[PDB]
RNA sequence: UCAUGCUUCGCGUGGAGAAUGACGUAGCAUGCUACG
RNA sequence: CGUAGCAUGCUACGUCAUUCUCCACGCGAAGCA
C-alpha cells in the first residue's frame, strides 16, 4: 500500500547507490547503510519518508552519478 | 504418430490383418499375416525411440540455450534496468518532498550535503539561476524538500559573500551563478 | 520490663554494646533462611523457617544501627555441655565466633542459652541461595547484601533490568565487589580446619554455619577423636561454593604483590608458560583438605571423570597467569638445514602444558603430509607478521599478515519486482492486513564482521560444582546409550559437499576437493594415526553470511581448516550418522517433518505423561556464550563410543586436539590474527550434535535443582522423598558412580519430564502437578540454572509455556503447528511465518533470480513449504499458497511464450500442468510414504 | 560389427535365402536357408553385445587414466606452492632478535604469542575514535609494550593518507574512523 | 564465502523384477507319409 | 511297437529388441531448518 512501498523503494534505492560505488566513501556509506536499515525497521510512515528523501538527497547530490531528464523523461 | 517410414508399412501390414479376420482363410495365412504384422510393429517401435530421444535432446538443448541467453542478458543491462525502476517507484509513491527536491534536482537546484531532518540542521544547496531562486526563495525564507529554513550566507560562485538585497531583477548578469545557499532548518 | 530487660543485660555479657532487641524481649525470633541439611529424615539445600534464636542488633556510638548481631538460643541441656566442650577446644582459634553460655530463668526454671557474639545478618549459604537460584521477580535478600557492603547503592536497582548480564554488563563489576570477601572466607575455612585437625574433632562444614565475615560457630555436631586425627568434612561447602567463586572474581588479589590489593601487579617472566608450582601452591593455599587428587597438567588424568574434575580447578587458576602465556608452543627446528619456527607443544587454561611425542629435530625433507602440518600452524605465520593492536574489540590481538586492514561491507537485497506487483494486484500488503512483510537483507558497513566477532566479549570463565557435574553427566550418557560410534578408515568416510572452502591458508590454492584428491587414503590415515600422539593448532577463518532476516545483525560462521576437519570426521563420524539415523530418541536430528514426521515427533514427545504441559525454550546466543566446561563434557560425552578403538592417551590427544583447533584456537578476520576466548566455533564437525547434549545437560541440571530445594518435609510421595534423599548422597555424599540409582533417575525423568531436542532448540512435555510441587522443573528452575551456569539471562522472549496440547508447541524450528483433519483422523502439520515464504519470493540475492521464468523450480519449493497455510483459520494465510500456485502458472505461460518466440519450436512438455494443483503438494504431507 | 568376421557369414546366409527364394525352390531347402539367416543373425547379435561391451569398457577407462593424471599434476603443483609459501617466510623474519629470545628459553620452547611483542620490526594499531588516540598513540612518539615506537604513516578507512595535524577533536567529524597508524620500533 | 539434516527437480550408470516381440536348443502331446 | 520324413499344440532353458515400477550410487540446479 504505503508503507510496503517504501521499503521495497529503499532498497532498491541502496542498490543503486551501492551501484555507483558509494562504498568507496566509507563515511557516506555508513550513513546510507543506517538510513536503509532503519526504513526497513519502522512502524510509522511519517518517518520512513522523510528518511527516504534523506536517503534520496545522497544520490541527487552527487549530480554527476546520473542524468535525471533522461530518467525522468 | 505418422512421417516415419516404418510406420507407412505397419498401418498396411495391420490393414491386411483387419481385412483378414473378414475373410477367415486358412490358418497359415492368419499366422504369416501376425508374423509380418508384429516384425512391422517392431520395426516401427524400434524407430519411434530414436525419434523420441533426438526429440528429448533438441528440448534440452534449446532449455539450455535460452536459459544462458536470459543470464547473459540479465547481468548485461543490470545498472540501466536498476535506475528505470527506481524512478517509476519513485513516481507511484508519489510523495511532496520526494517531488518536490526531484523537480528541483531537474533544473539543477541539487543539495551539497544529506537534507537533515533537525532543527538544529545544516543545509547548504545550489541555486544556477535568478529564475529558480526567486521561485523557491523570498526575502529570507527557503523553500525545500516541503519544509520551510531560514537562509544564512549566500556564497557567489567565487567564494564572495553575497548580500540578499543585491539579488534582485536586474542584478542577475553582475553576479555570478551559480549561487551557494547555507539555510538552517526552521 | 522487668523480665526482658534483665535478660538484654546479660545477653550484653561483659562485652557492653549497645544491644537493641529485634524481637519482642525474651521471646525467639523467626527467619526464613537457606540451610544446607542431611539427616535421616530429609536432605538438600533449601530455605526453611527457623524459631529458635533471639537476635539482638547492635548499634554505634551515634545511636546508628550496624551490622552486628548477637544470636542466643536455647537448647537441651546435654547440647549445652556438649557444645561448651567442643568450643573450649576450639576457642583460641581466630576463624571461631565468640560464644558465651550462660543460663536463665525463663518462666519458673533455669534455661541454658548459648550466645553467639557479632555475627553478620546473613549467612554464606544466603548469598549461595540467592546467587544460584536467582529471580528478578523477587530478589531482596540479593539486594540488601549488595547494599549493605557497599558493592552498589541502593537506587542502582531503580534501572530497568540491573541484572542482566547483555543489557547491563556493568553487573559484573558490583559481584566483583565481593570477591575480597570471599576470599577471606575461605583463607578463615582453611585456618578452622587446621584447628579442627589440631584439636583432634570430626564433623562436617556447611556453609549456613559461618557468617559473611568468615567465623563459625554451632559445633552441634563434632565428635572428639585423637588429639591429631581429627578430620573436617568439606565436600559439599566447596562444591556449593564454586559457582560464585568465579562470578565475584575472588582470586583477584592474587594478581598483585604480596596478594594485596593496593600493591602493583606482579611483573611475570614473559618467557614463562609453566604455572605448576604456582598452581600447586595456589590449591594449597584454598583447597587444602579437599581429599581428592589435582593433577596441574591433565595428561596425566586417571580417566574423563578425573580430567572433568581437575580441568574446573585449573579453570579456576588460569585467570590468575598472564594471557600471553596460553597458545601454541614454539620451537626451531632445522628441516635440510635452514631453521623453521614449528609448535612442539601447547599450554591450555584448561588442560595445563601438553608436549608433542614427536618432535624431529634436524630433519631432512618434508612429504605432503608434513608441508600440510607445517602451513596449517600458526606460528610461521605470526612469527613473520607485525604486531597488531586493535582497539575496536576488547579480544586478545596477535598480529597483522598484511600492511593493510581488510574492511568488508554487506550489500542489500535484489527486489522482485514482477512477483510483488503480482502480489498486489492479487490483494496483499494492504494497509490494517495481518500478512506484512517483516525479513528484508540488512546491509551493514566495513566495521561488521569485526562487531559480530567481538560479541565474543559474553564469554566469562565460569567454574562449575564438580559433584553436580559429574552425576549430570552420568545421567546424560543415558540418552546416548543407543547409538554406536567409534573410528573408521579414511576410505568409510562420507563428504557431502567437495566444492566448500579448505579455510586458511590452504583457500589460497584450491578447495577441499583438490585435498581429498592429493591425499591418498594412506596420507589420511597418516595424518589421522599422528593426530593421537601429537597437537596441530589451526587457524580459523570468519566468514559473513548473507541471508534473509528479521533481525538487524550480521552472522559470522567459522571457516575451519581442513587440517582439522579431515580428522575430526575420521573420529566422529560413524557415531554422527548413527544419531542421524535413529527414530524415536531425544534428539531428532534427521528426522523429516514430510509424510507425518512431524506427527510422529509430536506424539514421540508427548508420550505417556500424567498431567502434560507443554514448554519450551531458545539459548541467546549459543555459541558466543557457552562456557568452555561444557564444551569439553560435550566432546567427552561424544568419545565414551571408543573404548575399543583407542587408549586414555590417544583419547587425551584427540581431546587437546579439538580443544587446540575449535575452543581457543586463533581467529583469522580482516587479514589480523585475534585469540578466542572460548564458546564453539559454528563450522566445526560436531557442532550440531554438541549443542544437543549442552541443551540436555542444562534440562538434566534444571531438574536436579528443582528436586534439592524441595523441602523433604512436606513431601507427601514416600519413593520421591527416598528419591531426593539418594540423590544427595549419591551427589555430595558418594564418591563412586551408582549405576543403579543413575538407571533410577533416568526413568523417573523419563516418566515426568520427555523432551525433544535440536541443536538449541526443545520442547518438553511435563507433569504438571509435580513442577507445581516442585519435584520437577519449571521454567524458573531452568532461567535459574542458565543464570548461575551459563551467564545470561533468559527473558520471557525467548521461553513459551502451553497447557493445551491439542494445539501443540508454539515454535520449534520456527514452525507453528495446526491440528488438522487429513482424510478420516487428525495430525498435526508445521506451518511457517508468511512473511518469511512472501519475503522469499519478493527480495533475493540474486539477479539473475529475479527472472522467474529461469527460476519455476524455486517457486515450487516455496509452494511446498507453503501448502499446510491453506488450512489455517485466517482466510490471508490461505492465500500465501494460492498465490504461488497462480505465479507459478503464469511463469510457465510466459517461458512458453518466449521459447516459441525467440525459437519456433514449442516444448511439448505436458508434465509441468502438475506444478499449479494442490494434488502434487498435498502428497507430501500425508503418511504414505 | 562390420569388421568382425561373423557378419561375413550373416551376409552369405541372407545372400543365399535371398537367391533361393528368387529361384522358387521346393519348399524344404527355403525352410533350412530361413533356419541358417535366424541363426546367423542370433550369433552375430551375440557377438556384437560384446563388442559394444568392450567399446564402452574401453571408453571408460581412459576418463579414469586422465583424472588420475591430472590429479597428480594437481598435486605436484600445490606442493610447490606450499614449499615456496614456507620458504618465503622464514626470509621475512629478523633472525637476530628471534635467536636472542629463543636462546633464552630455558628448554628451547616459548609463548608463540610473545613472539611479535619482542620481536617484530612494525606496529599496526586501529584506532575507532578520537578519545582512543588521545589515549593510545597521541604525539610522534608512543610507548607500547615496554617498546618506543614513532609514527610513520596514518590512513584512514579508505586508505588515503592523514597528517597528525589533520586529528584535533574539532576536525574529528571530517575523518574517516577507523584510522590505522604504522610505527616503527624505536632504536 | 563453514558444519550438519531434510526435501524438490533434471541427467546418467548399474542391479532386480514386470509386460511385449523375434529367433534358437531340449522335453512332452496330437495329426499325416515310407520302411521294418 | 520301432526307424525315417512332414504338420500342429504345450513345457523348460537361452538370447537379444521395446516399454513401464521400485531401489543404489554418480553428476548438476534449487529450497528450507
Ligand atoms: N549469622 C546469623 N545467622 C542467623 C541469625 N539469625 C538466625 N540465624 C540462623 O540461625 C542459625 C544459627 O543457629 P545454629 O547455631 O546454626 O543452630 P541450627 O543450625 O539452627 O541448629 P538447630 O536449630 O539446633 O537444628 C544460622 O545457621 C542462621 O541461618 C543472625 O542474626 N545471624
Ligand atoms: N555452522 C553453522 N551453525 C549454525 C548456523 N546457523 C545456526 N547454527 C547453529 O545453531 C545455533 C543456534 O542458532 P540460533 O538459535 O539461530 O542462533 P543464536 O546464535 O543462538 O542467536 P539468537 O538465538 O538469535 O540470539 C547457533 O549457535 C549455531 O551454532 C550456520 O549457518 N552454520
Ligand atoms: P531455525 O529456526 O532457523 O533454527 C532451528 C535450529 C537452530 C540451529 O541449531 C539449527 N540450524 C539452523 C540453520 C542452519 O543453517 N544450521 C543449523 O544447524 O536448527
Ligand atoms: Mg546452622
Ligand atoms: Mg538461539
Ligand atoms: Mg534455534
Ligand atoms: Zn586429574
Ligand atoms: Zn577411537
Known amino acids: 500500500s504505503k508503507m510496503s512501498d517504501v521499503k521495497c523503494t529503499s532498497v532498491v534505492l541502496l542498490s543503486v547507490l551501492q551501484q555507483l560505488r558509494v562504498e568507496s566513501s566509507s563515511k557516506l556509506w555508513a550513513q546510507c547503510v543506517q538510513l536503509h536499515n532503519d526504513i526497513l525497521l519502522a512502524k510509522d510512515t511519517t518517518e520512513a519518508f522523510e528518511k527516504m528523501v534523506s536517503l534520496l538527497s545522497v544520490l541527487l547530490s552527487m549530480q554527476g552519478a546520473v542524468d535525471i531528464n533522461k530518467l525522468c523523461e | 504418430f505418422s512421417s516415419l517410414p516404418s510406420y507407412a508399412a505397419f498401418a498396411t501390414a495391420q490393414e491386411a490383418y483387419e481385412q483378414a479376420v473378414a475373410n477367415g482363410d486358412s490358418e497359415v495365412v492368419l499366422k504369416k499375416l501376425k508374423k509380418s504384422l508384429n516384425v512391422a510393429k517392431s520395426e516401427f517401435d524400434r524407430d519411434a525411440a530414436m525419434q523420441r530421444k533426438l526429440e528429448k535432446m533438441a528440448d534440452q538443448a534449446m532449455t539450455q540455450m535460452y536459459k544462458q541467453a536470459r543470464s547473459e542478458d540479465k547481468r548485461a543491462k543490470v545498472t540501466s534496468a536498476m535506475q528505470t525502476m527506481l524512478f517509476t517507484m519513485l513516481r507511484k509513491l508519489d510523495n511532496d518532498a520526494l517531488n518536490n527536491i526531484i523537480n528541483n534536482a531537474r533544473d539543477g537546484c541539487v543539495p551539497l550535503n544529506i537534507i537533515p531532518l533537525t532543527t538544529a540542521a545544516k543545509l547548504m544547496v545550489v541555486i544556477p539561476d535568478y529564475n529558480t531562486y526567486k521561485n523557491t526563495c523570498d526575502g529570507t525564507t527557503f523553500t525545500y524538500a516541503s519544509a520551510l529554513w531560514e537562509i544564512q550566507q549566500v556564497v557567489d560562485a567565487d567564494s564572495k559573500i553575497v548580500q540578499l538585497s543585491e539579488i534582485s531583477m536586474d542584478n542577475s548578469p553582475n553576479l555570478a551563478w551559480p549561487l551557494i545557499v547555507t539555510a538552517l532548518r526552521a | 520490663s522487668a523480665d526482658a530487660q534483665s535478660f538484654l543485660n546479660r545477653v550484653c555479657g561483659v562485652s557492653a554494646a549497645r544491644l537493641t532487641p529485634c524481637g519482642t524481649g525474651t521471646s525467639t525470633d523467626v527467619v526464613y533462611r537457606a540451610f544446607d541439611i542431611y539427616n535421616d529424615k530429609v536432605a538438600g539445600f533449601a530455605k526453611f523457617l527457623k524459631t529458635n534464636c533471639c537476635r539482638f542488633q547492635e548499634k554505634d556510638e551515634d545511636d546508628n544501627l550496624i551490622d552486628s548481631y548477637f544470636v542466643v538460643k536455647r537448647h537441651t541441656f546435654s ?207 584454598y583447597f587444602k583438605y579437599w581429599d581428592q587428587t589435582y593433577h596441574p597438567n591433565c595428561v596425566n588424568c586417571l580417566d574423563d571423570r578425573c580430567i572433568l574434575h581437575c580441568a574446573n580447578f585449573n579453570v579456576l587458576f588460569s585467570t590468575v597467569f598472564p594471557p600471553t602465556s596460553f597458545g601454541p608452543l614454539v620451537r626451531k627446528i632445522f628441516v635440510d638445514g635452514v631453521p623453521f619456527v614449528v609448535s612442539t607443544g601447547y599450554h591450555f587454561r584448561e588442560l595445563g602444558v601438553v608436549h608433542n611425542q614427536d618432535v624431529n629435530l634436524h630433519s631432512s625433507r618434508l ?76 546491509a551493514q558497513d566495513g566495521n561488521a564482521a569485526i562487531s559480530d566477532y567481538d560479541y565474543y566479549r559474553y564469554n566469562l570463565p565460569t567454574m562449575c560444582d564438580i559433584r553436580q557435574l559429574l552425576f549430570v553427566v552420568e545421567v546424560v550418557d543415558k540418552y546416548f546409550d543407543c547409538y554406536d560410534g567409534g573410528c573408521i578408515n579414511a576410505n568409510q568416510v562420507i563428504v557431502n559437499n567437495l566444492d566448500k572452502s579448505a579455510g586458511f591458508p590452504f583457500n589460497k590454492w584450491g ?55 579431515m580428522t575430526n570426521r575420521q573420529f566422529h563420524q560413524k557415531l554422527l550418522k548413527s544419531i542421524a539415523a535413529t527414530r524415536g530418541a531425544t534428539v531428532v536430528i534427521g528426522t523429516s517433518k514430510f509424510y507425518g514426521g512431524w506427527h510422529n515427533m509430536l506424539k514421540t514427545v508427548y508420550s505417556d505423561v500424567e498431567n502434560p504441559h507443554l514448554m519450551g525454550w531458545d539459548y541467546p546466543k549459543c555459541d558466543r556464550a557457552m562456557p568452555n566446561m561444557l564444551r569439553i563434557m560435550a566432546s567427552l560425552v561424544l568419545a565414551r563410543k571408543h573404548t575399543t578403538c583407542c587408549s586414555l592417551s590417544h583419547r587425551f590427544y584427540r581431546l587437546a586436539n579439538e580443544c587446540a583447533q575449535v575452543l581457543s584456537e586463533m581467529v583469522m578476520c580482516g587479514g589480523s590474527l585475534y585469540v578466542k576466548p572460548g564458546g564453539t566455533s559454528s563450522g566445526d564437525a560436531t557442532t550440531a550434535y554438541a549443542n544437543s547434549v549442552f541443551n540436555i545437560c542444562q534440562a538434566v541440571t534444571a531438574n536436579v535443582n528443582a528436586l534439592l530445594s524441595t523441602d523433604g518435609n512436606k513431601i507427601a ?31 523417573y525423568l523419563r516418566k515426568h519430564f520427555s523432551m525433544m531436542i535440536l541443536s538449541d532448540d526443545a520442547v518438553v512435555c511435563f507433569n504438571s502437578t509435580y513442577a507445581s510441587q516442585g519435584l520437577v522443573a519449571s521454567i524458573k528452575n531452568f532461567k535459574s540454572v542458565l543464570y548461575y551456569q551459563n551467564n545470561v539471562f533468559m527473558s520471557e522472549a525467548k521461553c513459551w509455556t502451553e497447557t493445551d496440547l491439542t494445539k501443540g508447541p508454539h515454535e520449534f524450528c520456527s514452525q507453528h503447528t495446526m491440528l488438522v483433519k487429513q482424510g478420516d483422523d487428525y495430525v498435526y502439520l508445521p506451518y511457517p511465518d508468511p512473511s518469511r515464504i512472501l519475503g522469499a519470493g519478493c527480495f533475493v540475492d540474486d539477479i539473475v533470480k529475479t527472472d522467474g521464468t529461469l527460476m519455476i523450480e524455486r517457486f515450487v519449493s516455496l509452494a511446498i513449504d507453503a501448502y499446510p497455510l491453506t488450512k489455517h483459520p485466517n482466510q490471508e494465510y490461505a492465500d500465501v499458497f494460492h498465490l504461488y500456485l497462480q505465479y507459478i502458472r503464469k511463469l510457465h505461460d510466459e517461458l512458453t511464450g518466449h521459447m516459441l518466440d525467440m525459437y519456433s519450436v514449442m516444448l511439448t512438455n505436458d508434465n509441468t500442468s502438475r506444478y499449479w494443483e494442490p494434488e502434487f503438494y498435498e502428497a507430501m504431507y500425508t503418511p504414505h510414504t
Not at chain 3, 265 to 283: A, S, V
Not at chain 3, 717 to 733: A, F, G, I, S
Open chain 3, 717 to 747: 510421595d514416600k519413593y520421591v522423598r527416598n528419591l531426593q534423599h539418594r540423590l544427595y548422597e549419591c551427589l555430595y555424599r558418594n564418591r563412586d558412580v551408582d549405576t543403579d540409582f543413575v538407571n533410577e533417575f533416568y526413568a
Open chain 3, 511 to 565: 578447495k577441499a576437493r583438490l585435498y581429498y584428491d592429493s591425499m591418498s587414503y594412506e596420507d589420511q590415515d597418516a595424518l589421522f594415526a599422528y593426530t593421537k600422539r601429537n597437537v596441530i593448532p589451526t587457524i580459523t577463518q570468519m566468514n559473513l553470511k548473507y541471508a534473509i532476516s528479521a533481525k538487524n545483525r550480521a552472522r559470522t560462521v567459522a571457516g575451519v581448516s581442513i587440517c582439522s576437519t
Open chain 3, 79 to 285: 547440647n549445652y555441655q556438649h557444645e561448651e566442650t567442643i568450643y573450649n577446644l576450639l576457642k583460641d582459634c581466630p576463624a571461631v565466633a565468640k560464644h558465651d553460655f550462660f543460663k536463665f530463668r525463663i518462666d519458673g526454671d533455669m534455661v541454658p542459652h548459648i550466645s553467639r557474639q557479632r555475627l553478620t545478618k546473613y549467612t554464606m549459604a544466603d548469598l549461595v541461595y540467592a546467587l544460584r537460584h536467582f529471580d528478578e521477580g523477587n530478589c531482596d535478600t540479593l539486594k540488601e547484601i549488595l547494599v549493605t557492603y557497599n558493592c552498589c547503592d541502593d537506587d542502582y536497582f531503580n534501572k530497568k533490568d540491573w541484572y542482566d548480564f547483555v543489557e547491563n554488563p556493568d553487573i559484573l563489576r558490583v559481584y566483583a565487589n565481593l570477591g575480597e570477601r570471599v576470599r577471606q572466607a575461605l583463607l578463615k575455612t582453611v585456618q578452622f580446619c587446621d584447628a579442627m585437625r589440631n584439636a583432634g574433632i570430626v564433623g562436617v562444614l556447611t556453609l549456613d554455619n559461618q557468617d559473611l565475615n568468615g567465623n563459625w560457630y554451632d559445633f552441634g555436631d563434632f565428635i572428639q577423636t585423637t588429639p591429631g586425627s581429627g578430620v573436617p568434612v568439606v565436600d559439599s561447602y566447596y562444591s556449593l561454593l564454586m559457582p560464585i567463586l568465579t562470578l565475584t572474581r575472588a582470586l583477584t588479589a592474587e594478581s598483585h604483590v604480596d596478594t594485596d590489593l593496593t600493591k602493583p601487579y606482579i611483573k611475570w617472566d614473559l618467557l614463562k608458560y609453566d604455572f605448576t608450582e604456582e598452581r600447586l601452591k595456589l590449591f594449597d593455599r
Open chain 3, 367 to 442: 612429504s605432503f603430509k608434513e608441508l600440510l602440518v607445517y602451513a596449517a600452524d600458526p606460528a610461521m605465520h605470526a612469527a613473520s607478521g607485525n604486531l597488531l593492536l586493535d582497539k575496536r574489540t576488547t579480544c586478545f590481538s596477535v598480529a597483522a599478515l598484511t600492511n593493510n586492514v581488510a574492511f568488508q561491507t554487506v550489500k542489500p537485497g535484489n527486489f522482485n519486482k514482477d512477483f510483488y506487483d503480482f502480489a498486489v494486484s492479487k490483494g496483499f500488503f494492504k494497509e490494517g492486513s495481518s500478512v506484512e512483510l517483516k525479513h528484508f537483507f540488512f
